[PDB]
């Protein structure tokens, strides 16, 4: 078990499949990046822009392609906002705090 | 797993199936009918007995009779190909593979004729000029890989060389989605 996601693509790399490089990383450490189809490596190498690459995870994300209606919608989750008491108090203290 | 716990369905099938099977099983009289024909038939060849004698079908007959009856209808009881026009769609992919850029297409042409015979089961192919161009559209190397015909097996009187007497025209006609689209048989 343990699927890495081939980053670039993002795609879950099941236990087999694909190939693995170890990069450097100082703000964390030492990663491994796993690439799926060398097509994914090569493009990477070819230093294309994930922000425009069709096939990437980026590309959907950024691009209208993920966007709004599918899952990015906000301001619709359940809530309650309403007027609240002290808790552990007679009615007079609750009036006194709220009032003046 | 199409039954279990989907209660009582069981009795229903076992019997129901009991008919369809029975019916199927039942459904013919067979080979010896033909052996009554054979002793005579070895005395010399009768195809009007033969094309239909050659086939049978016991699980098909509410549906096979549908395809068989047309085709039996001029053809399996006494041959006699029409004289038909159909318009077709062919898959060049298997066809164009491998061998030489420089030969695939002429050979395709030959093959086109051949398919046509193969199709018309009943042989001989004349081609429309358009097709001719259509083909040589690039000229060898490539060709367009999907073709749209209107083909007519048409009947002829006594004519021509070799073996002539029945004949075909096959023609281009176009508009893609060929691989979806289908061929259809042209009502006459």
């Amino acid at each position: 078990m343990r699927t890495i996601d081939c980053e670039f693509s993002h795609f879950a790399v099941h236990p087999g499949h694909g190939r693995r490089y170890v990069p450097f990383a100082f703000l964390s450490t030492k990663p491994v990046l796993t690439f799926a189809r060398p097509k994914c490596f090569a493009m990477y190498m070819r230093k294309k822009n994930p922000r425009f690459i069709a096939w990437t995870r980026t590309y959907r994300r950024i691009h209208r392609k993920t966007t709004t209606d599918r899952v990015g919608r906000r301001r619709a989750a359940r809530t309650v906002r309403a007027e609240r008491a002290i808790v552990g108090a007679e009615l007079s203290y609750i009036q006194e705090v709220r009032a003046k | 797993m199409t039954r279990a716990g989907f209660k009582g369905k069981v009795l229903g099938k076992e019997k129901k199936l009991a008919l369809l099977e029975a019916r199927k099983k039942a459904a013919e009289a067979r080979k010896s009918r033909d052996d009554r024909r054979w002793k005579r038939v070895l005395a010399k060849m009768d195809p009007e007995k033969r094309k239909k004698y050659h086939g049978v079908g016991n699980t098909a007959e509410h549906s096979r009779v549908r395809g068989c009856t047309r085709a039996s209808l001029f053809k399996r009881t006494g041959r006699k190909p029409d004289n038909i026009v159909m318009e077709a769609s062919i898959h060049l992919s298997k066809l164009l593979k491998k061998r030489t850029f420089h030969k695939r297409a002429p050979i395709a042409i030959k093959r086109i004729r051949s398919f046509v015979g193969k199709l018309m089961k009943t042989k001989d192919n004349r081609i429309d000029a358009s097709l001719n161009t259509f083909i040589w559209h690039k000229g060898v190397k490539g060709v367009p890989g999907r073709v749209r015909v209107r083909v007519e097996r048409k009947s002829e009187t006594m004519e021509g060389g070799k073996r002539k007497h029945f004949y075909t025209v096959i023609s281009h006609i176009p508009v893609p989605s060929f691989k979806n689209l289908t061929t259809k048989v042209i009502e006459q």
Binding site: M1, R2, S9, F11, A12, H14, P15, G16, H17, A36, R37, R70 | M1, T2, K31
Partner: protein
């Protein structure tokens, strides 16, 4: 490839999860159709008797006729009569008597149900048979058993239980007429190799002029029987569940199929039950293959294993393996120009309108 856990007494890779290549082999039942006694004579096995089916199916006949074609199928028909011969030859009495009396290897005549529930590719729909020796207590007991199993059907599990090493007999994958090189592995000469190259320098001596055989030459390569040993059965399958299902694969947690996204070229198959063997397999693709009991005692770190699958990854392959499960895959794109919403929604009402109209 499959995932399962490592361990042994003191291996390097003990305690690891591992991922491994495995094979899948289509399986349903063979049906037992005869019993055979060959007896050992001081000249080897000579068959002494053969015991029968009493009902003879068409396929098996199709093979049991050299063909179907125009086949009148008339084989077995007299044999077929023999139910009468309950009141008639108690052949069974004689056979058995012989068996007891003399038989020395018992083989069972079994043949396959050869549609295998497969659809298309491949064919040889003719049908197939083979003798199977049965070993394990007492001729009679065997026999009884056999006898009991006459007409009865076999599932692999009845002779197996998985984790097991079994042995294999198969025909090589074919290569036709072969470059001797592939056939034997010789090494060339330079670039300056006048008058050809593959065809190596030294092949016989003056003495002995008699061309030696420890040289070979080209020829067929592949298409051989080979009788290969030690293939572990890693799993024994059953009952394809439905309108899409069977599998379930633990950590799959999904209830998948045991079929890849592709699931074998020309062979999108899995059409019954399977044998999962660890490792790969001989021969040409798409072909029938013979499992035989292992002969090695197999005592091993390997046998002696808790190989007890967990989990199997189940790629595509075909187009490349890129996104496990069409299910997953489907998600990722989800919506697209097709269907979906902007066509399916239209479709749902449209469909609804048509459906309603035809009924009313």
């Amino acid at each position: 490839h499959i995932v399962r856990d490592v361990d042994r007494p003191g291996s390097k890779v003990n305690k690891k999860e591992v991922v491994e290549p495995v094979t899948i082999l289509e399986a349903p039942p063979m049906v037992v159709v005869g019993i055979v006694g060959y007896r050992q004579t001081p000249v080897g096995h000579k068959t002494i008797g053969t015991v029968w089916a009493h009902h003879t199916s068409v396929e098996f006949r199709r093979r049991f006729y050299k063909n179907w074609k125009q086949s009148a199928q008339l084989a077995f028909t007299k044999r077929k009569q023999f139910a009468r011969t309950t009141e008639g030859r108690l052949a069974e009495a004689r056979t058995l008597k012989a068996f007891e009396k003399k038989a020395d290897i018992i083989r069972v005549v079994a043949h396959t149900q050869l549609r295998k529930l497969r659809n298309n590719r491949v064919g040889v729909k003719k049908a197939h048979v083979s003798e199977i020796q049965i070993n394990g207590g007492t001729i009679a007991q065997k026999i009884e058993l056999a006898k009991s199993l006459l007409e009865k059907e076999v599932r692999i599990d009845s002779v197996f239980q998985q984790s097991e090493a079994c042995d294999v007999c198969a025909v090589t994958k074919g290569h036709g007429f072969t470059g001797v090189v592939k056939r034997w592995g010789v090494a060339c000469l330079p670039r300056k190799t006048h008058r050809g190259l593959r065809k190596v320098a030294c092949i016989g001596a003056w003495h002995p002029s008699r061309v030696m055989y420890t040289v070979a030459r080209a020829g067929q390569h592949g298409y051989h029987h080979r009788t290969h040993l030690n293939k572990k059965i890693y799993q024994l399958g059953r009952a394809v569940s439905m309108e899409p299902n069977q599998a379930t694969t633990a950590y799959d947690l999904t209830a998948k199929t045991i079929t890849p996204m592709g699931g074998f070229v020309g062979y999108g198959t899995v059409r019954n039950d399977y044998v999962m063997l660890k490792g790969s397999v001989a021969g040409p693709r798409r072909r029938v293959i013979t499992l035989r009991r292992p002969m090695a005692p197999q005592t091993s770190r390997k046998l002696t294993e808790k190989i007890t699958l967990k989990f199997i990854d189940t790629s595509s392959k075909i187009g490349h393996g890129r996104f496990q499960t069409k299910k997953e895959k489907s998600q990722w794109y989800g919506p697209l120009k097709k269907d979906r919403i902007r066509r399916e929604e239209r479709l749902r009402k449209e469909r609804a309108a048509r459906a309603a109209e035809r009924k009313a």
